[PDB]
Amino acid sequence: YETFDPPLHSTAIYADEEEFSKHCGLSLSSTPPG
Amino acid sequence: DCHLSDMLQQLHSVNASKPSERGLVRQEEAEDPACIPIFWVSKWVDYSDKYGLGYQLCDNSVGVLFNDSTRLILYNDGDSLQYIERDGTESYLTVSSHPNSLMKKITLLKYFRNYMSEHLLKAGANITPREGDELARLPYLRTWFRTRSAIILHLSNGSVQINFFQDHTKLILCPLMAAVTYIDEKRDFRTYRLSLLEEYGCCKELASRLRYARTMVDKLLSS
Amino acid sequence: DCHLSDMLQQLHSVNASKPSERGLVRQEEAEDPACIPIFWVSKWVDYSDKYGLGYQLCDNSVGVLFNDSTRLILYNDGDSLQYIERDGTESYLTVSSHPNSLMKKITLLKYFRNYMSEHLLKAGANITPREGDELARLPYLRTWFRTRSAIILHLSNGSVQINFFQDHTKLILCPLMAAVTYIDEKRDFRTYRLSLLEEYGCCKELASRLRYARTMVDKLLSS
Numbered sequence: 038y039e040t041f042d043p044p045l046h047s048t049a050i051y052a053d054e055e056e057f058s059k060h061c062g063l064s065l066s067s068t069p070p071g
Numbered sequence: 072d073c074h075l076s077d078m079l080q081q082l083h084s085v086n087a088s089k090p091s092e093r094g095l096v097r098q099e100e101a102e103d104p105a106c107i108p109i110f111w112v113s114k115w116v117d118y119s120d121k122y123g124l125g126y127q128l129c130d131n132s133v134g135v136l137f138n139d140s141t142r143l144i145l146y147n148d149g150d151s152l153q154y155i156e157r158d159g160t161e162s163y164l165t166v167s168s169h170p171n172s173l174m175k176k177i178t179l180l181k182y183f184r185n186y187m188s189e190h191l192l193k194a195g196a197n198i199t200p201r202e203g204d205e206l207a208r209l210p211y212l213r214t215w216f217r218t219r220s221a222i223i224l225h226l227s228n229g230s231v232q233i234n235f236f237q238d239h240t241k242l243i244l245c246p247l248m249a250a251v252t253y254i255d256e257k258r259d260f261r262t263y264r265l266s267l268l269e270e271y272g273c274c275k276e277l278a279s280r281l282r283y284a285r286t287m288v289d290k291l292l293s294s
Numbered sequence: 295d296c297h298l299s300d301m302l303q304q305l306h307s308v309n310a311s312k313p314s315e316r317g318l319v320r321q322e323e324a325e326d327p328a329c330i331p332i333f334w335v336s337k338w339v340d341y342s343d344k345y346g347l348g349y350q351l352c353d354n355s356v357g358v359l360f361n362d363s364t365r366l367i368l369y370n371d372g373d374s375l376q377y378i379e380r381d382g383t384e385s386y387l388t389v390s391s392h393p394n395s396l397m398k399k400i401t402l403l404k405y406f407r408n409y410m411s412e413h414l415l416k417a418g419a420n421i422t423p424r425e426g427d428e429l430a431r432l433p434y435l436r437t438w439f440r441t442r443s444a445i446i447l448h449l450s451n452g453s454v455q456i457n458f459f460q461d462h463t464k465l466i467l468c469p470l471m472a473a474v475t476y477i478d479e480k481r482d483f484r485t486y487r488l489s490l491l492e493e494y495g496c497c498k499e500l501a502s503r504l505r506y507a508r509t510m511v512d513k514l515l516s517s
Binding site for chain 3: 049051052054057058060061062064065066067068069070
């Protein structure tokens with residue numbers, strides 16, 4: 038498995054922007070519009 | 072292929088009607104959730120420079136179309152296997168009790184399965200397939216190719232799937248029901264009867280992807 | 295660094311003068327618009343549990359301090375980049391170059407930028423940064439930490455910014471000029487010479503926050 042490095046593939050887990058934005062809304066952040 | 076010929080005729084009829092050039096487009100009237108597909112490709116890995124193309128179907132089964140034109144499918148029970156030879160001949164086995172001649176291909180399939188489970192998002196996880204109670208036979212990947220804009224996947228049951236790289240949109244074409252399922256950039260899944268898209272029209276985004284689909288089905292037929 | 299040491303000495307001097315315990319206070323006389331900062335943190339989001347802390351600078355540039363103690367910056371042109379490793383080697387590249395080793399970190403930064411731009415207000419929007427020079431070297435976030443009451447942000451140019459959570463008041467300390475910019479609840483920005491605050495006094499609101507800033511700067515030096 039160690040040398041199993043596919044050069045092309047479908048979208049990786051880290052590239053799920055919907056889960057990213059979800060977590061940012063749940064995390065602490067600067068001030069949002071009121 | 073009898074199915075590709077049907078799909079081509081279905082797509083020419085809808086595309087010839089210019090569905091986006093209507094006074095009032097009523098795409099919603101074409102929705103028919105009863106045509107929701109049972110199987111679609113939810114993950115894929117293009118290692119064709121060494122081994123082949125691995126993929127996952129929505130039921131969590133996995134498969135590999137090796138560079139030697141054979142296919143190995145691992146059912147979602149994690150043990151049952153289906154081997155399809157170059158000429159289409161199908162045989163059935165298990166990882167537990169297999170022929171020794173398939174041990175390397177089984178090992179490769181496991182690597183594909185592990186890589187997909189560890190690194191890749193599952194497309195269509197929100198959407199629930201039409202259920203034959205798993206009676207529906209598992210399709211295999213007959214052929215595929217990649218273009219500048221998308222990867223095209225032709226399954227043994229006749230369906231054609233087109234995944235567009237830029238915006239993550241996808242078309243699932245089902246010639247048996249003359250239907251198409253569109254997953255938009257919002258990952259929202261909708262299934263339409265092509266005949267009803269012809270009658271009621273559709274938005275420009277889907278209409279253009281249906282023109283692209285026709286170009287791709289012609290390509291599949293020319294090969 | 296030597297800049298934090300200077301900042302601590304300036305804060306010690308101003309606090310030791312007890313600027314709010316004066317028979318007469320003339321805070322306006324301590325203002326010096328010539329010391330308005332050119333760079334401050336306008337937005338930020340704490341994704342430390344998974345990826346790290348992303349932030350936006352007043353020039354719309356974007357940066358992120360990853361949990362591996364590396365940094366990646368996206369200038370206001372939207373393509374050029376700057377990647378600072380753990381050791382501190384400043385390497386310059388672009389999104390168009392499609393670097394393979396930094397592809398994941400690029401994607402995450404773009405996501406930070408997206409959320410901030412579509413969900414968060416830009417602090418200091420009503421202020422024009424000093425200098426017609428938009429050629430000033432972009433700074434990066436050297437370190438940061440969070441108390442129950444504020445977030446402390448230490449930039450590479452020596453600036454220290456303290457944002458108070460409950461009332462949205464903010465301090466921007468510039469050791470190079472022994473100056474501080476204060477942003478009150480109404481978002482009015484005032485820039486002062488710390489040495490002049492000693493000589494003219496100031497309100498309890500600013501005095502008490504300069505007392506807090508000193509203890510925060512001590513914390514930065516202890517680390």
